[PDB]
Amino acid sequence: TQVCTGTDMKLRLPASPETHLDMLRHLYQGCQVVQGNLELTYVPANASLSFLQDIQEVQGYMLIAHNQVKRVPLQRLRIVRGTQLFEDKYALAVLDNRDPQPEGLRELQLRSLTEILKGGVLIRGNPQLCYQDMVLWKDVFRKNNQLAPVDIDTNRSRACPPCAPACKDNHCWGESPEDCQILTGTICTSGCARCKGRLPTDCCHEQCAAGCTGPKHSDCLACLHFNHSGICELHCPALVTYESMHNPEGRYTFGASCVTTCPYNYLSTEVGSCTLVCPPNNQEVTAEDGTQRCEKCSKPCARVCYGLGMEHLRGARAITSDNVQEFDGCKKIFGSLAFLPESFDGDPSSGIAPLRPEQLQVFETLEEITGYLYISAWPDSLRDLSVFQNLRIIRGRILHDGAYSLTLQGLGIHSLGLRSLRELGSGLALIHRNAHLCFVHTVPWDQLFRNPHQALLHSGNRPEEDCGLEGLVCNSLCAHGHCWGPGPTQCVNCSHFLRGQECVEECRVWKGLPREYVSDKRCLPCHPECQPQNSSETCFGSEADQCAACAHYKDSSSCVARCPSGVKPDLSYMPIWKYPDEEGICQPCPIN
């Protein structure tokens, strides 16, 4: 697309360096607006970072830390809004880009960045870096962001070449005549916050953010608040106008844009904003057909199951013996599930018992997670993720490290067993360091994804061709070779009939055990009082009334194990007394 979602990993090491770059690539390739924080970290010496080259806007902060690359190609980046700040104060943080000694970041080259709405700048520990002190920062910082901290270290093990002669003022982002700083704040006339030149004819509209092509609200380089189809405006048009009526111009706010409709995986509020999370004392209602909306509860909200990151589990790290039981009977969890080594080791200092595999069945009910699933430890006695057999959707409205809606890491599992998983609402799946794990590639991951930024990243599992030579392959009854584990329960779809959750070639219509009838490709058992037929069907439905014939006795039209002796109909005093015919037909007893 063009709008994408950033991350939230701060300075923490990537779990998967073998995969980190792929991740950055899948998140940012083609992306123009990052909603969230743009965090580029631990990029090695030779990485290609060219998938960053379309980024024109960061809504949160931008963090460039712990890389060895010499160049970070962000020359189209126009604005960092700073709706979130690093260390709660910096819109731009460039940290520790060096090697343990020549490598390390050399120039920032942010030659399009003409706007920082909120927060300041931190540049520290970057020993090859030049030109960090030749930016006029206060031109960059919005007029009312002028007191933003500038904490810019210039300790260097190299000599900086000057700003190229062609630079009209002595300001630049780098040594080349292309990296000249373009000034759009400090050079303006009067009460003009942003301009394209020194004259008032060059003033930008007040609703523009980084600069302009001309004077109009259709000529902005970026919108200060909201882009309403090519016009920057203070507000999106209301959904309702005042008698009060519906407004056919109505728009929803999504980021710095006015949208006709909320994007996938988002909820609509009455006031027409889009959220990942409802305001307090709301409920999520699924319009019958796809939509979800936030609606305030007139009386007390129905009791709901909160997972990690949410309400009283806001600060909780992991599912544990002290908390598993809060999930009994839960179909929907608002929040996330994470199972870490601590979950299964316990902690003898708090007295926390290790989580027993049996306790995990409290999840057999689970159909939906609004946040993420993160599994970093799992019992060795559980060969698969079968306790989540009925899990249908991981929404990924909250994501681990702000990137992953499904993580399985360093586990001993042999198969997945996630047999109901049909949807990863957003975020990436990361499945790595599971040395005995097969049936990863038998899953049709493209079918669970919902945007083109999502992918499965994988490494260190069992090679697929090594599984495929040991008979760990999809059962042959699974349609299209798609399955989640070995055997006939693990199909994504059955090509034939299902008996319970087992895929079978045939129902027991003529042959078999207890006899069966068919209904919607489903093997269903005849009543136990039906007599199995040697030649024909044994039943045509489930009830005692629906047998070819009775194994024991018959009462009116249904096959029965015993004749009624003294059975009283609901609201009657008169009991029925019967006895079986010589041919097994229940007849009325001659006495009451």
Ligand X SMILES: *[C@@H]1O[C@H](CO)[C@@H](O[C@@H]2O[C@H](CO)[C@@H](O)[C@H](O)[C@H]2NC(C)=O)[C@H](O)[C@H]1NC(C)=O
Binding site for ligand NAG (CB under 6 A): 125, 153, 155
Quote the CA–CA distance of 382 and 328 in Å, as a whole number.
Answer: 20
Nearer to ligand X, 232 or 385 (CB): 232
Nearer to ligand NAG, 59 or 97 (CB): 97
- Per the listing, tokens 């980021």 go with 255
Residue 94 interacting with ligand X (CB under 6 A): no
Least separation in angstroms between residue 159's CB and ligand NAG is: 16
Least separation in angstroms between residue 219's CB and ligand X is: 8
Structure tokens at 487: 């055997």
C-alpha 206: how far from chain center: 37
Q: Of these, 161, 230, 357, 575, which contacts ligand X (CB under 6 A)?
A: 230
Residue 155 interacts with which of ligand X, ligand NAG, none, CB < 5 to 8 Å by class? ligand NAG
Q: Of these, 1, 13, 17, 44, which contacts ligand X (CB under 6 A)?
A: 44
Residue 44 interacts with which of ligand NAG, ligand X, none, CB < 5 to 8 Å by class? ligand X
Least separation in angstroms between residue 147's CB and ligand NAG is: 24
Cα dihedral sign for 143, 147, 151, 152? Answer: positive
Please provide the DSSP assignment of 284-336 as one string. Answer: EEE-TTS-EEEEE-SS-PPP-EE-BTSGGGTT--S--TTTGGGGTT-SEEESB
Collect all residues with Cβ–Cβ distance below 8 Å to 229 and sequence separation of at least 6.
258
Nearest CA to 175 out of 71, 325, 264 is that of: 71
Nearer to ligand NAG, 153 or 284 (CB): 153
Quote the CA–CA distance of 550 and 560 in Å, as a whole number.
Answer: 8
Least separation in angstroms between residue 28's CB and ligand X is: 17
Nearest CA to 472 out of 492, 464, 410, 480 is that of: 464
C-alpha 202: how far from chain center: 44
Quote the CA–CA distance of 215 and 548 in Å, as a whole number.
Answer: 86
Count of chain residues binding ligand X (CB under 6 A) = 10
Collect all residues with Cβ–Cβ distance below 8 Å to 531 and sequence separation of at least 6.
538, 547, 548, 549, 550, 551, 559
Nearer to ligand X, 223 or 421 (CB): 223
Nearer to ligand NAG, 73 or 125 (CB): 125
Least separation in angstroms between residue 125's CB and ligand NAG is: 6
Quote the CA–CA distance of 152 and 139 in Å, as a whole number.
Answer: 16
Residue 341 interacts with which of ligand NAG, ligand X, none, CB < 5 to 8 Å by class? none
Site string for ligand X, 331-350 (x = CB under 6 A): --------------------
Nearer to ligand NAG, 155 or 557 (CB): 155
- Helix (H) or strand (E) holding 17, with range, is helix 17-28
Nearer to ligand NAG, 98 or 578 (CB): 98
Residue 237 interacts with which of ligand NAG, ligand X, none, CB < 5 to 8 Å by class? none
- Per the listing, tokens 């999840």 go with 363
First to last CA, the chain: 80
Least separation in angstroms between residue 129's CB and ligand NAG is: 12
Nearer to ligand NAG, 157 or 519 (CB): 157
| Contact status, residue 318 vs residue 339, Cβ threshold 8 Å | yes
Least separation in angstroms between residue 214's CB and ligand X is: 12
Nearer to ligand NAG, 95 or 182 (CB): 95
Least separation in angstroms between residue 76's CB and ligand NAG is: 31
Which span sits near ligand X by CB under 6 A: 111-119, 176-184, 226-234, 510-518? 226-234
User: For residue 529, what is the DSSP state?
Assistant: T
Residue 230 interacts with which of ligand X, ligand NAG, none, CB < 5 to 8 Å by class? ligand X
Quote the CA–CA distance of 264 and 261 in Å, as a whole number.
Answer: 9
Nearer to ligand NAG, 126 or 336 (CB): 126
Residue 223 interacting with ligand X (CB under 6 A): yes
Nearer to ligand X, 70 or 383 (CB): 70
Nearer to ligand NAG, 156 or 562 (CB): 156
User: For residue 18, what is the DSSP state?
Assistant: H
Residue 241 interacts with which of ligand X, ligand NAG, none, CB < 5 to 8 Å by class? none
Distances (CA, A) of 450 to 295, 430, 447, 492: 25, 16, 8, 18
Least separation in angstroms between residue 181's CB and ligand NAG is: 25
Quote the CA–CA distance of 418 and 388 in Å, as a whole number.
Answer: 6
Least separation in angstroms between residue 124's CB and ligand NAG is: 7
Nearest CA to 35 out of 233, 253, 184 is that of: 253
Quote the CA–CA distance of 185 and 191 in Å, as a whole number.
Answer: 11
Residue 430 interacting with ligand X (CB under 6 A): no
Structure tokens at 361: 């069945």
By Cβ distance, which residue is nearest to ligand NAG?
155
Least separation in angstroms between residue 260's CB and ligand X is: 11
Residue 153 interacts with which of ligand X, ligand NAG, none, CB < 5 to 8 Å by class? ligand NAG
Nearer to ligand NAG, 150 or 473 (CB): 150
For residue 111, give the 3-state DSSP assignment.
coil
Residue 229 interacting with ligand X (CB under 6 A): yes
Q: Of these, 13, 45, 166, 301, which contacts ligand X (CB under 6 A)?
A: 45
Residue 180's Cβ-side half-sphere holds a number of Cα atoms within 13 Å equal to 12
Residue 387 interacts with which of ligand NAG, ligand X, none, CB < 5 to 8 Å by class? none
Please provide the DSSP assignment of 114-180 as one string. Answer: -EE-S-EEEEES-TT--STTSS-HHHHB-GGGTT--EEE----SSPPP---TT-SSS-BSSSSTT-B
By Cβ distance, which residue is nearest to ligand X?
230
Q: Of these, 67, 112, 227, 320, which contacts ligand X (CB under 6 A)?
A: 227
Nearer to ligand X, 95 or 209 (CB): 209
Structure tokens at 150: 């500038």
Site string for ligand X, 183-222 (x = CB under 6 A): -------------------------------------x-x
Interface residues toward ligand X, by CB under 6 A: 44-46, 220, 222-223, 227, 229-230, 232
